[PDB]
Design a protein around this ligand. Sequence first.
Ligand SMILES: NC(=O)c1ccc[n+]([C@@H]2O[C@H](COP(=O)([O-])OP(=O)([O-])OC[C@H]3O[C@@H](n4cnc5c(N)[nH+]cnc54)[C@H](O)[C@@H]3O)[C@@H](O)[C@H]2O)c1
Ligand SMILES: NC(=O)c1ccc[n+]([C@@H]2O[C@H](COP(=O)([O-])OP(=O)([O-])OC[C@H]3O[C@@H](n4cnc5c(N)[nH+]cnc54)[C@H](O)[C@@H]3O)[C@@H](O)[C@H]2O)c1
Ligand SMILES: OCc1c(F)c(F)c(F)c(F)c1F
Ligand SMILES: OCc1c(F)c(F)c(F)c(F)c1F
Ligand SMILES: [Zn+2]
Ligand SMILES: [Zn+2]
Ligand SMILES: [Zn+2]
Ligand SMILES: [Zn+2]
Lengths: 374, 374
Amino acid sequence: STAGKVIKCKAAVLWEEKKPFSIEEVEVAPPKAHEVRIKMVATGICRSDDHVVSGTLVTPLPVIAGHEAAGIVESIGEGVTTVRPGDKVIPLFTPQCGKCRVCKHPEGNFCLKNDLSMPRGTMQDGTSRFTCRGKPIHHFLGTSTFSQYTVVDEISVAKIDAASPLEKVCLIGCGFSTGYGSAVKVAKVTQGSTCAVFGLGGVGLSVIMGCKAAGAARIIGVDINKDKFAKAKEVGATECVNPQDYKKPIQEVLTEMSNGGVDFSFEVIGRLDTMVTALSCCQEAYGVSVIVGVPPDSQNLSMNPMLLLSGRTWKGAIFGGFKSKDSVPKLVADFMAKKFALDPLITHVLPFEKINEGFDLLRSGESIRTILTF
Amino acid sequence: STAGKVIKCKAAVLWEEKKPFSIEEVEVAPPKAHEVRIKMVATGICRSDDHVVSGTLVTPLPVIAGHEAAGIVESIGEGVTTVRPGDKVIPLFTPQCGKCRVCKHPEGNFCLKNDLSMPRGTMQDGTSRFTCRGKPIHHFLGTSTFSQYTVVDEISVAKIDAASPLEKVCLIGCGFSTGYGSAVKVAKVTQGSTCAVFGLGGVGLSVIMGCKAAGAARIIGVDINKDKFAKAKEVGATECVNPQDYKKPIQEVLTEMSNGGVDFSFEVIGRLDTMVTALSCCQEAYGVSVIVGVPPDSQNLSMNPMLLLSGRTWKGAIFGGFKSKDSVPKLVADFMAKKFALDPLITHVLPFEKINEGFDLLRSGESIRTILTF
Ligand SMILES: NC(=O)c1ccc[n+]([C@@H]2O[C@H](COP(=O)([O-])OP(=O)([O-])OC[C@H]3O[C@@H](n4cnc5c(N)[nH+]cnc54)[C@H](O)[C@@H]3O)[C@@H](O)[C@H]2O)c1
Ligand SMILES: NC(=O)c1ccc[n+]([C@@H]2O[C@H](COP(=O)([O-])OP(=O)([O-])OC[C@H]3O[C@@H](n4cnc5c(N)[nH+]cnc54)[C@H](O)[C@@H]3O)[C@@H](O)[C@H]2O)c1
Ligand SMILES: OCc1c(F)c(F)c(F)c(F)c1F
Ligand SMILES: OCc1c(F)c(F)c(F)c(F)c1F
Ligand SMILES: [Zn+2]
Ligand SMILES: [Zn+2]
Ligand SMILES: [Zn+2]
Ligand SMILES: [Zn+2]
C-alpha cells in the first residue's frame, strides 16, 4: 500500500541539456491538497520533450520531462473531487482551472495557471514532489510523465473511459489532439478547401487527419524527409512535396499548385523560416495560417506585414485550441466510438527503460510516435 | 457635349516625391470599352495619398493620386452596364471584378485586379488616360481622384444614391469604410469587449465608431498627439493614452489597464513597431489584432512567434474587408438613413486648388479629413 507514503520508483531524469536521460530511482512525495498521484501506464515521445534536451525549449533543470501520457490514479489529496483511486487519467500539460479569464472565454484554452510561458518547473504551490540522490527535481508542464509515478494538480488531470487502451489514448495528451484541433478548431478547415501541412511527424499527421475529417479536397504534405510521405498519404494527404526537390522557394511552388494560394496552411515543425513560408503560401486575401511548431527560444522571425494587410490571418495555438479538461474525456470517448484512429501515429512500442533509444528513433527520422510502456 | 472627346481640365500632378502637387492642365482621354469618365465633385485627403508623396508607398511617378472621392458620371465607354451619365458614383480603389477567386469567396475583398500589390499606375489595359505637358501621367489605384475628371475601369466604380451629399460620402471611398469595417467585419468586435485603437486620425476614428457600434464596453485610443483625444472620446473612446507619458512600453500599460490584455487591437498608423506593440497588447490566448496602417515600402518587422503560439490571431485588411462594389452603395444608403455619422471626421473644407494647404494641415497634425471641392 502506497497511499500517504513516499514512493521510491524509477524515472527518467534529465540532469543537463544535450545528455541522455538517466533512468534511476526517485522519491515521489504523496499528493497534497488538490493533488493527484498517478501510476503511469504509457507515455509518448513528443518532439517538444526533445526540445528540452536540445535547448530549443528552456525549462528549469534538472527535470522529469514527459507530457503525453496516460495512467491510473494511485491516490488523491484532500479536496479532490474529479478523479478517484483506480481511475484512468490523462495528465493535462495545459491546465483548465475553470476560474481564469481564459478558461471562462468561449475560445480560449491557454489557462493562466499554465507552466509554459514562464516555466517554474513546479507544482501550482511552487514546490516539487520529486527528489533524486537527495536533490529536488523540477516538474515539466505540471505533468512529468517520464516516471513510474507522478503528482499533478487536479486542474492538470482528466478522468477518461475506464475501458480506454492507455497505450493508444496517451496520444490524446498531446500530439493527436494538438494536430487534429489545429485543423478542426483553430483553423476551422472548410469542406472542399486546399490545405498545406508543413511537417509530417506525429502532430502534422494529426493535422492531416483533421483536415480530411473537415472535408478538405486537397491536403498537400510538405517535408524534407520523403520517407514521411507514404504515411501522410495513408491518413489523407493528396500530394506530398519535398522543398529540396525544387529550384523555387516552396511558397512559390505551393502558390502555383493551388492556383494562387492555399486556403489553410499549418507550420508543424518549429522553424522561423517555415512559419513565414507557411504564411506566404496561403491565399493573400482570405488564407489562414496556423503556427503549431515550437521554434528555438528567444528568436524573432522577420516578415513583411503586407502579407497580412492584403487579408491573411495568422494564428497559433497550444493543444489544438482545446479546453483541456473538458475536451480530453470527449476525445477518448470519440476514439472508443471509432471517430478517429491513433494506430497510424504509432510506429514503435518500447519499454520505458528504452527511453533513450526512443529519442534516437525520433532524432534519426525513423519514428512518428514511440509509445513507452511502464 | 464632351462624350467621345478629350477633356482638358485641371489636376494635381505629382512629378517628384517630397514636392508639392502641381495644379495644372491635363488631357483626359475618353473612356474605352468598360471604362467610365467621372466629373469629380469632392475628394478627401487620406494619409495613404501622403504616403505617395513621402515615398512610404511606392507607385510609378509622375502620378495623379487621390482615391477617396465622389463624383458624377460624364460618359461611359462601350459595354458599360452598371452606371450611366449623370449617376453619382464613388471610385473603388479596391476593385470588385466579380469573377476572380477572391471576388467569389464569401470573405475575400482584395480582388486580383487591384493595382495595390504591385502597382503599375495604369488602367486595367496597361495604358494611361492622362497626358500633361505632352507626357503620359500614371494613374493611382485605378482611381486618380485628384483631377476635375478621371477615367476608371467599370470594376472600379459604384453607383450610389442620386440624393447623396457627395462632399460627405466621399469618405465612404476610403477612410470611413476602412476603419468601420476593420472593426465590424475584420475583427468582428463583440459586445462588452475591450478594444485598443492605435492612431486617432480619420481611419482610427472610424475604427472607434465601429467598435462602439459593435457594443464594445471599453475603447482605448492610443496616440502620441494628445490633441486627437477630444474627438476620439466624442466618437466613442472611453479613455485615451499617450505612449510618451509612460516610462514602460505601451503594450505593458495596455495589458495592465485591461487586466491581462485587450480583446481587439488595431494598428491604424503605419509603423512596424506599433504593429508588434498592437499584437502584444491583445490577450495572449484569445486576443485579435488587425493591421490597418500602411507599412513603409519593402521593410520587414521582427517579432517573436510565441505571441501567436499562445492563441493570438493577427490579421490585416484593405478597405475594412468590404467587397467594394457590393458594399459602397449600401454604406451610402445607411449613411442616408443616419446609421453612422461622417461629420466628426471632417475638420476642414478647401477648394481643390488649395490641395497643398490640405496636405500641410494633415502633416502638421491639425486635421482629420480635409474635403476638397472641385
Ligand atoms: N502547439 C502545440 O501545442 C504543440 C504540440 C505538440 C507539438 N508541438 C511542436 O510541433 C512540432 C512538431 O512536433 P512532432 O510532430 O512531434 O515532431 P516531429 O515528429 O519531429 O516532426 C517534424 C517533421 O518536420 C520535418 N521537417 C524538419 N525540417 C523541415 C523543413 N525545413 N521543411 C519541412 N519539413 C521539415 C521533419 O522531417 C519531421 O517529419 C514541434 O516543434 C513540437 O515541439 C507543438
Ligand atoms: N488598410 C487600408 O485599407 C487603409 C485605408 C486607409 C488608410 N490606411 C492607412 O491607415 C493609416 C492611418 O491613416 P489616416 O487615419 O488617414 O492617418 P492619420 O490621420 O495620419 O492618422 C494617424 C495617427 O497616428 C498617430 N501616430 C503617429 N505615430 C504614432 C505613434 N508612434 N503612436 C501612436 N500614434 C501615432 C498620429 O498622431 C495620427 O493621429 C495610414 O498608414 C494609412 O496609409 C489604410
Ligand atoms: O508539445 C507540447 C508543448 C508545447 F506546445 C510548447 F509550446 C511547450 F513549450 C512544450 F513544452 C510542449 F510540451
Ligand atoms: O488608404 C488606402 C490605401 C491602402 F490601404 C494601401 F494599402 C495602399 F497601398 C494605398 F495606396 C491606399 F491608398
Ligand atoms: Zn484557467
Ligand atoms: Zn507535445
Ligand atoms: Zn475580382
Ligand atoms: Zn485611403
